[PDB]
mmCIF file of C-alpha atoms in Angstrom:
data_model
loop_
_atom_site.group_PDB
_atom_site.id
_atom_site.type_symbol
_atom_site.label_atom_id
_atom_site.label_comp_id
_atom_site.label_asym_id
_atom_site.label_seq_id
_atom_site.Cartn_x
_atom_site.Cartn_y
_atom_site.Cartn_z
ATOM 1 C CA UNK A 1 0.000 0.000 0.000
ATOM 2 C CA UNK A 2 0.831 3.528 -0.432
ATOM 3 C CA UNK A 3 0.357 3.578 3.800
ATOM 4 C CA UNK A 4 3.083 1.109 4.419
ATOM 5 C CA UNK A 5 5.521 2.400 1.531
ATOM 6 C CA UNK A 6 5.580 6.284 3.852
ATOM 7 C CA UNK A 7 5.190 3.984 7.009
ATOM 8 C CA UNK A 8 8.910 2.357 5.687
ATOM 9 C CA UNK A 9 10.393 6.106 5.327
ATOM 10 C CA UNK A 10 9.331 7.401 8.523
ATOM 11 C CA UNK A 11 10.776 4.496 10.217
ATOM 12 C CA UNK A 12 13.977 4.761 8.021
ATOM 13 C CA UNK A 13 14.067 8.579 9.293
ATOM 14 C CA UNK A 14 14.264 7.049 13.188
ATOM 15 C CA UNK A 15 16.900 5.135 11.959
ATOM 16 C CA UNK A 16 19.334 7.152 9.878
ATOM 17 C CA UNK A 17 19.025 9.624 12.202
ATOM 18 C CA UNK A 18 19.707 7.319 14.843
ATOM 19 C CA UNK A 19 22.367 4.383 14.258
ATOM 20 C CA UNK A 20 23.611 6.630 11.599
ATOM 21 C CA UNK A 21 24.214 9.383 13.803
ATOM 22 C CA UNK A 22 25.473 7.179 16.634
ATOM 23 C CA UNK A 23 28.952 8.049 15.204
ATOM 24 C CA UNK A 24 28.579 10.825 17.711
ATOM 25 C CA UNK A 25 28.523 9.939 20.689
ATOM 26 C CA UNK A 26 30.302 7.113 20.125
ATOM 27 C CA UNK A 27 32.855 9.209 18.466
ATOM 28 C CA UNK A 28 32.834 11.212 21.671
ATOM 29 C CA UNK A 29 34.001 8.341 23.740
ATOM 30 C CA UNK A 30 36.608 7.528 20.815
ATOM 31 C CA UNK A 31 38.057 11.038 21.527
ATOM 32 C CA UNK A 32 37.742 10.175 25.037
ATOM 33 C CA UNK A 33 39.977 7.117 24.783
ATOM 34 C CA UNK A 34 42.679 9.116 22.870
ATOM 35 C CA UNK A 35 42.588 11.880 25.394
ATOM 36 C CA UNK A 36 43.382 9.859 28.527
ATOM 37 C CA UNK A 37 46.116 8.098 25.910
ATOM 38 C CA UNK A 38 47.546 12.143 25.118
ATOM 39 C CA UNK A 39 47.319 13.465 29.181
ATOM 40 C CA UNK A 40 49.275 9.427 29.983
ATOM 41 C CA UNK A 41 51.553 10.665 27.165
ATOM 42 C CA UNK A 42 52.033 14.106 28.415
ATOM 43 C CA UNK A 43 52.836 12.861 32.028
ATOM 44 C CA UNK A 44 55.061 10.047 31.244
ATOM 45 C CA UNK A 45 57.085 12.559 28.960
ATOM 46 C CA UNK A 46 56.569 10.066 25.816
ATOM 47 C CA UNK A 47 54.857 11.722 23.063
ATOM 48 C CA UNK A 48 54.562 12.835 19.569
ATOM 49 C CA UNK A 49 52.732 15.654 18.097
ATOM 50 C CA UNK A 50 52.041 14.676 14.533
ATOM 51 C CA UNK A 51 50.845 17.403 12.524
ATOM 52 C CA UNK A 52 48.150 17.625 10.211
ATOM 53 C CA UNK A 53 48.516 21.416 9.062
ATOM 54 C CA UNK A 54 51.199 24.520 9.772
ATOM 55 C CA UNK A 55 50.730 28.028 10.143
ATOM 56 C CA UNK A 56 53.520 30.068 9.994
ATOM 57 C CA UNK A 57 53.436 34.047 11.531
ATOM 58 C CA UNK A 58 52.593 35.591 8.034
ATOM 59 C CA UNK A 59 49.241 33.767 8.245
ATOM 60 C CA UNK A 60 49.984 31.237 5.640
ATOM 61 C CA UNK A 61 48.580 27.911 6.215
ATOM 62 C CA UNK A 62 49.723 24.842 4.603
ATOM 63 C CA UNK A 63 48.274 21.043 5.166
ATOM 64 C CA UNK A 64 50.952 18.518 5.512
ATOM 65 C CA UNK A 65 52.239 15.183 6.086
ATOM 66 C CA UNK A 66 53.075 14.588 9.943
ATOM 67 C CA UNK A 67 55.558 12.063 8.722
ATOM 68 C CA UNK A 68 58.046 15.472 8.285
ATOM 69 C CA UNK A 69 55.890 17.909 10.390
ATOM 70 C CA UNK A 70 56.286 16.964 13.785
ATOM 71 C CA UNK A 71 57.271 17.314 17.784
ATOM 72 C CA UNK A 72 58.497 14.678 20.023
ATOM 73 C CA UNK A 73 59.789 14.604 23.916
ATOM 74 C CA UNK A 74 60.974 10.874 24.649
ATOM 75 C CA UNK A 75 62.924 9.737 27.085
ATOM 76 C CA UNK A 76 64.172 13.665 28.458
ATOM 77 C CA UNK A 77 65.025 14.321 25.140
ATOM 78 C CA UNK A 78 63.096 16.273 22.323
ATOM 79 C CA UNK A 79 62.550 16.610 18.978
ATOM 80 C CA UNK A 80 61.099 19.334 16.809
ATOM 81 C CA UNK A 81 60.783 18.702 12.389
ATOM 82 C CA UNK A 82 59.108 20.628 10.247
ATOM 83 C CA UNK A 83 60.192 20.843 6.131
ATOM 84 C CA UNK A 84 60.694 24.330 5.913
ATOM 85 C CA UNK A 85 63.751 26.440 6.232
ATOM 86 C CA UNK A 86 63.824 29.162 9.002
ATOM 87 C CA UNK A 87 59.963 29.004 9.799
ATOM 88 C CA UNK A 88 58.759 30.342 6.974
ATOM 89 C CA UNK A 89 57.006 28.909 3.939
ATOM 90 C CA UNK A 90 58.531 29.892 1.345
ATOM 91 C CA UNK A 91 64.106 20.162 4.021
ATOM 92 C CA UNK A 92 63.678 22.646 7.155
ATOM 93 C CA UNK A 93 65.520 22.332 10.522
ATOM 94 C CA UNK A 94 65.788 19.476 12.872
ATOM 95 C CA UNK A 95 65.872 21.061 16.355
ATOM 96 C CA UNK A 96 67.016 18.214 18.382
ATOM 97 C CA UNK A 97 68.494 18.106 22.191
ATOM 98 C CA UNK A 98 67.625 18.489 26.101
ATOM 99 C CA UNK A 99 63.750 19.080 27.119
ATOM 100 C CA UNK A 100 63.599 21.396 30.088
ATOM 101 C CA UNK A 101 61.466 23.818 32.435
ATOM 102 C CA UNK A 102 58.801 21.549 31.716
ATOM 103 C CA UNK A 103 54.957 23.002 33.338
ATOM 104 C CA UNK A 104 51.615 20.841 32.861
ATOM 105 C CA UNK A 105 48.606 22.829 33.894
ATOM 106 C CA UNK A 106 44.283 22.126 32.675
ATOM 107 C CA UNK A 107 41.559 24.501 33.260
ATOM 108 C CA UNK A 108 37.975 24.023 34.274
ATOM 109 C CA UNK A 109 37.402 22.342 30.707
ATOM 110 C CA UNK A 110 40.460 19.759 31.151
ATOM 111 C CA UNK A 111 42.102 21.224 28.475
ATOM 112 C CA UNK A 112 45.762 21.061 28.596
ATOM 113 C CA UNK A 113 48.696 23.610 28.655
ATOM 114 C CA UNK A 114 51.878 22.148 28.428
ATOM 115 C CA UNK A 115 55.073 23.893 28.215
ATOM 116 C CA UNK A 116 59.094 23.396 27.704
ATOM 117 C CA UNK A 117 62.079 24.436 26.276
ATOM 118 C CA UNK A 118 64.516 22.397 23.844
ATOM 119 C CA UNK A 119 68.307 22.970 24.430
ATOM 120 C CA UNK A 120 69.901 22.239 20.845
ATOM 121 C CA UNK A 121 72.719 22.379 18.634
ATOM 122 C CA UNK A 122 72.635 25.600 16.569
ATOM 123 C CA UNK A 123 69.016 27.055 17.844
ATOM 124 C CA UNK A 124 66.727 26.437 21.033
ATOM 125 C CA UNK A 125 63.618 27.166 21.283
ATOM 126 C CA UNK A 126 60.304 27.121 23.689
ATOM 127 C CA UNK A 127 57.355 25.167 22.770
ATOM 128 C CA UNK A 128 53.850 26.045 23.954
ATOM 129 C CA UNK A 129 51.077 22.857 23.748
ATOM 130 C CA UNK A 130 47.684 22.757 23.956
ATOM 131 C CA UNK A 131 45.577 20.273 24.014
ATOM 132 C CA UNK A 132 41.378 19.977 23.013
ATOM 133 C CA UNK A 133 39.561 18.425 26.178
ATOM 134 C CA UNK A 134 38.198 15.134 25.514
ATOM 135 C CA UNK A 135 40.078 15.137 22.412
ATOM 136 C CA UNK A 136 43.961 14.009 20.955
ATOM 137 C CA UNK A 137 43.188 17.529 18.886
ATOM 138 C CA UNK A 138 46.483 19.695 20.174
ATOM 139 C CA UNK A 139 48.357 22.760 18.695
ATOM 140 C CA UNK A 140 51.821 23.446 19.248
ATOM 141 C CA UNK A 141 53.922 26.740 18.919
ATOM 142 C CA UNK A 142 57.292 26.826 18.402
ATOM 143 C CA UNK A 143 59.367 30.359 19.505
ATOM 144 C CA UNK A 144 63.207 29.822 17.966
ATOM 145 C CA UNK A 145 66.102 31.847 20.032
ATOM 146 C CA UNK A 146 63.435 34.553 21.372
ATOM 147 C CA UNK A 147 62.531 35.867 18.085
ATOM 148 C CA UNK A 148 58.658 35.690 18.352
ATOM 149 C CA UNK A 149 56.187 33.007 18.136
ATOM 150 C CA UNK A 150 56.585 31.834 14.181
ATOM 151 C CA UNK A 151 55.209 28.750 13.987
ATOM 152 C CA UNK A 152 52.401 27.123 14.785
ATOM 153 C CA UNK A 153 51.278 22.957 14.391
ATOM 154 C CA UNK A 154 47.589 21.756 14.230
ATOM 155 C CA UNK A 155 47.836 17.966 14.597
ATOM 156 C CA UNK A 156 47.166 15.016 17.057
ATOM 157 C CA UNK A 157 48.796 14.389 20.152
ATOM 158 C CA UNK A 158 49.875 10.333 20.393
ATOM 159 C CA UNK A 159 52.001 8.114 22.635
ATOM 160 C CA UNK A 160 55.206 8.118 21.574
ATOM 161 C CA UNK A 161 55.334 4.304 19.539
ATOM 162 C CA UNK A 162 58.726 2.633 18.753
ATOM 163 C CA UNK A 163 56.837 1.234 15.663
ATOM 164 C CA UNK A 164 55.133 4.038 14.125
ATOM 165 C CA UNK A 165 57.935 6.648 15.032
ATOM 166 C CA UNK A 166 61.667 7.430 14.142
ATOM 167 C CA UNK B 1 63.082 3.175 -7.367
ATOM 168 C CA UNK B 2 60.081 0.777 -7.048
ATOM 169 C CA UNK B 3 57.867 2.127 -5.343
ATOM 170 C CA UNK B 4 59.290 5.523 -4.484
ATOM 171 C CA UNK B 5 58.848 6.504 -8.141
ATOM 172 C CA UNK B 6 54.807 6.210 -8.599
ATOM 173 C CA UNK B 7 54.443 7.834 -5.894
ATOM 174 C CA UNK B 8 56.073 11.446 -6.877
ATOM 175 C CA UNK B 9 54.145 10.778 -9.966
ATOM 176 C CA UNK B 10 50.859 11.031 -8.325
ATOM 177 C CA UNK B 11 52.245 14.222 -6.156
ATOM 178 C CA UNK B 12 53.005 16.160 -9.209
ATOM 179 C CA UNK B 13 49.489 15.354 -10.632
ATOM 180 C CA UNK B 14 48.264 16.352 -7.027
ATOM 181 C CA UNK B 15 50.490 19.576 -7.174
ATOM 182 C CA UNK B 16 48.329 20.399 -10.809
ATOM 183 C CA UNK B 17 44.730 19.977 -9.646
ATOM 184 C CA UNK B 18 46.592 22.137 -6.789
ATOM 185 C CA UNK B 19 47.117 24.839 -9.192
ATOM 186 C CA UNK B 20 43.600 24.746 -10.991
ATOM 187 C CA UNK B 21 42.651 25.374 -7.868
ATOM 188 C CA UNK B 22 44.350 28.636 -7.244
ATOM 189 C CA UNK B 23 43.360 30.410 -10.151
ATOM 190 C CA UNK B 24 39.962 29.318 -9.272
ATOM 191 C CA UNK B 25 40.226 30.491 -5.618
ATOM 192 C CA UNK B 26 41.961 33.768 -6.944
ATOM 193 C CA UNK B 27 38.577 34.434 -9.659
ATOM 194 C CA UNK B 28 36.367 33.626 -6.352
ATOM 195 C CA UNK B 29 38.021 35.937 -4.318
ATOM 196 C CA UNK B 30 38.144 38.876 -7.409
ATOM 197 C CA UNK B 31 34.964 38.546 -8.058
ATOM 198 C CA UNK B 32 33.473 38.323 -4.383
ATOM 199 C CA UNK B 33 31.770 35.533 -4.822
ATOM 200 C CA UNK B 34 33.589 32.298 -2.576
ATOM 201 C CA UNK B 35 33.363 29.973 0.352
ATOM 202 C CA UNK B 36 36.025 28.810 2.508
ATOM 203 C CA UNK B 37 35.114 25.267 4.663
ATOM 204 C CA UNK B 38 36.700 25.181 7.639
ATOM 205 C CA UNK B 39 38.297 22.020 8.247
ATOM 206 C CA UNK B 40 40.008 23.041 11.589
ATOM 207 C CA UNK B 41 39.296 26.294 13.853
ATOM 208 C CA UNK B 42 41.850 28.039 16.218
ATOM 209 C CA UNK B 43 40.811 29.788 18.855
ATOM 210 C CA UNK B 44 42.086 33.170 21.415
ATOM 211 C CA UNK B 45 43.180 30.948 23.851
ATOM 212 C CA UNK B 46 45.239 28.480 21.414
ATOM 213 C CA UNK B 47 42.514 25.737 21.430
ATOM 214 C CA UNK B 48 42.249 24.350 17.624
ATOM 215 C CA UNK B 49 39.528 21.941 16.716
ATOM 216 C CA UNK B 50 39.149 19.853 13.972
ATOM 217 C CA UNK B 51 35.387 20.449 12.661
ATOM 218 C CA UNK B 52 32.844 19.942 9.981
ATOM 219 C CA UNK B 53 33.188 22.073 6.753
ATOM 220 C CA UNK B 54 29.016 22.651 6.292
ATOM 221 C CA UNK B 55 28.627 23.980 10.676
ATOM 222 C CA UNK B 56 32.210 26.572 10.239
ATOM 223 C CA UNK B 57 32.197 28.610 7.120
ATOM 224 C CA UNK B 58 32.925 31.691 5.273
ATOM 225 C CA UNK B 59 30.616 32.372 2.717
ATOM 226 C CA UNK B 60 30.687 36.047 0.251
ATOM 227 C CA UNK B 61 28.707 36.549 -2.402
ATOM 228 C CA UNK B 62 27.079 39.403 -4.379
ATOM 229 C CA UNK B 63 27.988 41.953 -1.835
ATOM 230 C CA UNK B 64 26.668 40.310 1.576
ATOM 231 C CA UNK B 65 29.064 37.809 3.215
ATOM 232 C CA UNK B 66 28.423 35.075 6.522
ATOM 233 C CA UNK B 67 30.210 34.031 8.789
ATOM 234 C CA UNK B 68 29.075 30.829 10.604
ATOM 235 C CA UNK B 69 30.646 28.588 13.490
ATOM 236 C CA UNK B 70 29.419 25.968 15.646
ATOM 237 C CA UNK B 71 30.706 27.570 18.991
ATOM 238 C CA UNK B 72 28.661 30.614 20.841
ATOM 239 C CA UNK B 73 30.481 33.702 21.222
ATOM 240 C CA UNK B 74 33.307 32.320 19.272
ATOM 241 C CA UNK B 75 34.923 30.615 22.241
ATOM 242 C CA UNK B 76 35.104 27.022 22.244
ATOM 243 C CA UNK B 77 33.722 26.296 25.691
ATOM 244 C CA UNK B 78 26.454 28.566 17.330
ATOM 245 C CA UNK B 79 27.034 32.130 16.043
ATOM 246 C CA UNK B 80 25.664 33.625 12.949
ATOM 247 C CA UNK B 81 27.322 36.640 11.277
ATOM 248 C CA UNK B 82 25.510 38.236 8.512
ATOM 249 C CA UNK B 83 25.563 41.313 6.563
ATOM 250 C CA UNK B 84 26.838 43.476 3.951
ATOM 251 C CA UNK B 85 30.252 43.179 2.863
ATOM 252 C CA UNK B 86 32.971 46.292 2.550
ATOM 253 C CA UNK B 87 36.379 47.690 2.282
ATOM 254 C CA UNK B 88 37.517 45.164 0.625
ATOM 255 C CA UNK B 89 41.326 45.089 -0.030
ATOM 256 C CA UNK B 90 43.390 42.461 -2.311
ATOM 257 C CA UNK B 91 46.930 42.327 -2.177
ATOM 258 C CA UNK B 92 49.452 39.582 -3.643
ATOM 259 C CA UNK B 93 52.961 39.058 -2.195
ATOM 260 C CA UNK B 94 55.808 38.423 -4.612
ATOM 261 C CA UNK B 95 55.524 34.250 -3.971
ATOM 262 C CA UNK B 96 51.508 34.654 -4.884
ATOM 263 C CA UNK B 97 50.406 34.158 -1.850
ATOM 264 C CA UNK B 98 46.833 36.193 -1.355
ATOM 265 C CA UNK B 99 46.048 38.498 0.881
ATOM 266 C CA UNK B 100 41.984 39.590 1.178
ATOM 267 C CA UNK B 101 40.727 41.632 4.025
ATOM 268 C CA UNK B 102 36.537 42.564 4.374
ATOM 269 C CA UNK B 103 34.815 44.137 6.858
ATOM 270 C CA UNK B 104 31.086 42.787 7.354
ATOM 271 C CA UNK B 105 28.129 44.915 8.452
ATOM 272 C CA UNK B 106 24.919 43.731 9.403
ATOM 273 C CA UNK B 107 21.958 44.156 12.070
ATOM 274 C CA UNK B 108 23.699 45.395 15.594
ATOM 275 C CA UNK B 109 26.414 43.029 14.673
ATOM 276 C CA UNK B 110 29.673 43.688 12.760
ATOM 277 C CA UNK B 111 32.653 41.675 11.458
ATOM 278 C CA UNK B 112 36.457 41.959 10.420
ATOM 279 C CA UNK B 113 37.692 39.361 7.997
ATOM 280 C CA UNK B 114 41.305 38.730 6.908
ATOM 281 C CA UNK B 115 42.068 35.667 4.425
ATOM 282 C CA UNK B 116 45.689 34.407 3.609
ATOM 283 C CA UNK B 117 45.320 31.998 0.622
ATOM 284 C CA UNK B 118 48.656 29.670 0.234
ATOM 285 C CA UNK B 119 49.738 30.540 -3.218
ATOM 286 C CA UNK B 120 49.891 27.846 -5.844
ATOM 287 C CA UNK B 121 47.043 25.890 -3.680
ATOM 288 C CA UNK B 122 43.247 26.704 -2.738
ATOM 289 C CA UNK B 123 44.162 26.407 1.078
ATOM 290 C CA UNK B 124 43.585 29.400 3.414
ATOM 291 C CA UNK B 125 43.523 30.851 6.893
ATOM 292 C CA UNK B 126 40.814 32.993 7.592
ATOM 293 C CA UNK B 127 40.704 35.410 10.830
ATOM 294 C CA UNK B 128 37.605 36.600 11.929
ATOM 295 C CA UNK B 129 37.164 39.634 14.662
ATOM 296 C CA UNK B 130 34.334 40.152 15.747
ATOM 297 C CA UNK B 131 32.780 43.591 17.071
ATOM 298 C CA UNK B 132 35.524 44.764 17.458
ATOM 299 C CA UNK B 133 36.576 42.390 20.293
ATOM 300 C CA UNK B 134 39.967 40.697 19.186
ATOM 301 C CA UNK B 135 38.024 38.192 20.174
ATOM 302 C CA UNK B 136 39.544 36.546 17.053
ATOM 303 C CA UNK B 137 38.896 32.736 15.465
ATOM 304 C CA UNK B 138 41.056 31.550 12.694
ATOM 305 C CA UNK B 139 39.556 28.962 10.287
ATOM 306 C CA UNK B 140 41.573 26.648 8.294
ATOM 307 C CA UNK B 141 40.498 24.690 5.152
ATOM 308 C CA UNK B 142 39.885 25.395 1.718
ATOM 309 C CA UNK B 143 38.395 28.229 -0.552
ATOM 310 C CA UNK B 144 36.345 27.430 -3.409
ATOM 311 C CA UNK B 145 33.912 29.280 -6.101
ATOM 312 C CA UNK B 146 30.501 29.975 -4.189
ATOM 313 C CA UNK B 147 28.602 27.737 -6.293
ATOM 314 C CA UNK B 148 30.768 25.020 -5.938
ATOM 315 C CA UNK B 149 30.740 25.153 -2.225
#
């Protein structure tokens, strides 16, 4: 009948609206489980930042591979990679060495503010993080021998993974 | 050799559709008529948050622009900016990389808007102040033609 062809739509709209749309809240506790994974991360000192997009202090933004876009503190030691030259846009700098003055603080909304500096070869630099509550969502800025903030890294925030990570 | 070889293939066919894309974000943006989808938004107090592209958008066309965003009073613990669009300024920096600033006016509520499009791409940053406030949300995604967006 013409009564049971709209009676299997209306039905249909209770349930792509509803086990469709699950990958909300369910998505919600995924986020969850990947921000207890990035706070464990934070506190144990084992962690990568891999970055899905770079904005440098000229406004430019730029999506990227987090394969050569990233930050890492493992083991009191700390990495930061990104493929361009002297933080600008237009093969980068590796600014590798000690990880110090390091401050963990969360607001009301447990999101994160984690800070440090990283002691290197030819430049240091001081590294602001902060992290989405209830999310691995994190952006990090990077300040290079006190020049200014200059760039800035939109990624997620992971345990630091002998596998996935070099 | 093996498979290090297709693989720069397909990023220099990636790196054309790239470039079709600029002079079609460029034509947008000259004849004020574009969208930019926000795939990620940053917020005052360094929050970013990756987010759908149809709930965060810039939208201009035909003289009267939006702004829209998921997150009331543009902090991220949903606003709608309409209104008519002026002083509009276009500027290009020697590496093509674009440089369009708008203010928006509408009903008790005003807007400032500055977009940095990446040159030889369609992606852009766009910062949004709000009444004034510096108050300020950047948006991060990708600009395309009005209609197609």
């Amino acid at each position: 009948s013409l009564q049971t062809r709209k009676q299997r739509e209306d039905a249909k709209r209770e349930a792509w609206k509803k086990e469709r749309q699950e990958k909300k809240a369910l998505e919600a506790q995924q986020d969850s489980v990947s921000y207890v994974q990035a706070i464990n991360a934070l506190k144990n000192g084992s962690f990568v930042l891999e970055a899905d997009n770079v904005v440098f202090r000229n406004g430019i933004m730029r999506f990227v591979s987090s394969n050569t876009n990233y930050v890492e503190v493992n083991d009191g030691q700390g990495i930061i990679q990104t493929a361009f030259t002297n933080f600008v846009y237009n093969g980068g700098v590796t600014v590798q060495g000690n990880v110090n003055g390091i401050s963990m603080r969360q607001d009301k909304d447990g999101n994160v503010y984690y800070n440090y500096g990283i002691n290197g070869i030819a430049v240091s630099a001081t590294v602001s993080i902060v992290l989405t509550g209830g999310t691995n969502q994190a952006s990090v800025t990077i300040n290079p021998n006190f020049s200014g903030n200059t760039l800035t890294m939109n990624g997620y925030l992971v345990p630091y993974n002998e596998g996935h990570h070099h």
